[PDB]
Design a protein around this ligand. Structure first.
Ligand SMILES: [Ca+2]
Ligand SMILES: [Ca+2]
Length: 293
DNA sequence: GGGTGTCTGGTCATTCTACTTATTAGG
DNA sequence: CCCTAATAAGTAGAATGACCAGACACC
C-alpha cells in the first residue's frame, strides 16, 4: 500500500537513521571505501510498515536484524537519490535533520566523485565527525587533526498534521494506568506519553502549544536522561488527543493500541469506570494492550 | 587486475516505550 | 471531611537507532 509522505517523514524522524562508513581498505586508491545508508529497524510485528515505505519509495531492501527485529535499509547510491528528493520535499524537524543534511553533503561529495581523492576522504571524515556518534577510534588516529565534532541546533515548527501522526506512531504510547485508590473498587487513568532525548527539548514543548494540553516530565537513568510529554487530564484526552489521532490515522501496531485506548476512553466518558463490570471491561482491555494483545 | 560499488549478516549501545507507586490537586 | 482526577519521580528492558565485519558484484 502507499504511505502518506508527511506520515513517512514523521515516522522517519522517530525511527530512521542515516549512516556514513569510512572503512580502511588496502586495495583502495584512496585507502578507504565509503558507504551511505538510511535504515528503519522495528520489531517484526510492524514489518508491514516497512513494506509500505518500500512500496512507496520503490527502493530499499527489507531484511531480518536478528530473531525479533527487521530493517529496511537503503545503501545503493542511485537509490539514495530517491531518499534525498523525498526529504527535500518533506524535511524532518528533529535534531536528526542535522544528520540527514550531513548525510546529503556526503552524497554530494560522492556525486562529484571527490571521494576518490585524498581531500575528498578528508572532507567526508569531517562530515562524519558531526554525524550521529562521530568518528571512530581508528579514524581519529588516522586523522588526528579533524577534531571539530560540534553541531548546529535544529528548530522547525511541526510542518504538517500528518507529520505528528507518523512521529507519534514512532515514539508514542497510549497507556491505561490502574492505580490503587481508597474506595470500594482502583483509579483508572488514561495517560498519553511521548519521550525524546533532550536535544529536542524545544520540539517537546512545541507539542503543548500544538496540541493544546499536556506537560513535560524530565526523567533520568544514571548518565542518560530523556524528556516525556504527557497528557493525563481526561478533558484534553477526550477532546484533543483522541480526536486528533482519529482525524490523522496512525499506522502499524500502535494503531490497535490506540483503538483499544479509545475503547477505555468511551467507558470513562460513560462513568462506567467506577462500576464493577466497568473496571472489569477496561481491565481486560489493558490486559490485551501493549505488551500482550 | 585494478578499482569501486553493494550486499549479507549480523552486533553494540541507548533512547525510547511501558509499566509502577507515591502524592497532591480539586470540586 | 468526602471520593476522584491529575500530576509526578522512578525505573525496567527491549524496541529501537547506530555501528560492525566480511565477502560478493561489477566495469
Ligand atoms: Ca527516536
Ligand atoms: Ca516505535
Amino acid at each position: 500500500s502507499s504511505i502518506n509522505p508527511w506520515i513517512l517523514t514523521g515516522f522517519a524522524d522517530a525511527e530512521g537513521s542515516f549512516g556514513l562508513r569510512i572503512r580502511k581498505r588496502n586495495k583502495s586508491s584512496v585507502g578507504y571505501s565509503t558507504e551511505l545508508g538510511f535504515e528503519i529497524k522495528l520489531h517484526n510485528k510492524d514489518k508491514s510498515i516497512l513494506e509500505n515505505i518500500q512500496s512507496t519509495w520503490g527502493v530499499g531492501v527489507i531484511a531480518n536484524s536478528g530473531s525479533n527485529a527487521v530493517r529496511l535499509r537503503v545503501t545503493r547510491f542511485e537509490d539514495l537519490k530517491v531518499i534525498i528528493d523525498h526529504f527535500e520535499k518533506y524535511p524532518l524537524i528533529t535534531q536528526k535533520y542535522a544528520d540527514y543534511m550531513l548525510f546529503k553533503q556526503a552524497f554530494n561529495v560522492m556525486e562529484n566523485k571527490e571521494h576518490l581523492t585524498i581531500e575528498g576522504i578528508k572532507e567526508l571524515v569531517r562530515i562524519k565527525a558531526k554525524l550521529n556518534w562521530g568518528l571512530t577510534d581508528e579514524l581519529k588516529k588516522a586523522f588526528p587533526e579533524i577534531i571539530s565534532k560540534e553541531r548546529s541546533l535544529i528548530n522547525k515548527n511541526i510542518p504538517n498534521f500528518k507529520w505528528l501522526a507518523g512521529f507519534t506512531s514512532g515514539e508514542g504510547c497510549f497507556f491505561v494506568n490502574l492505580l490503587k485508590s481508597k474506595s470500594k473498587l482502583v483509579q483508572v487513568c488514561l495517560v498519553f506519553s511521548i519521550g525524546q532525548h533532550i536535544r529536542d527539548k524545544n520540539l517537546m514543548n512545541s507539542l503543548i502549544t500544538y496540541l493544546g494540553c499536556g506537560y513535560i516530565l524530565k526523567k533520568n537513568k544514571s548518565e542518560f536522561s530523556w524528556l516525556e510529554f504527557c497528557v493525563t487530564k481526561f478533558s484534553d484526552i477526550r477532546d484533543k488527543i483522541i480526536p486528533f489521532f482519529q482525524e490523522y490515522t496512525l499506522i502499524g501496531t500502535k494503531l490497535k493500541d490506540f483503538e483499544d485506548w479509545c475503547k477505555v476512553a468511551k467507558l470513562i466518558e460513560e462513568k462506567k469506570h467506577l462500576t464493577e463490570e466497568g473496571l472489569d471491561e477496561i481491565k481486560k482491555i489493558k490486559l490485551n494492550m501493549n505488551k500482550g494483545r
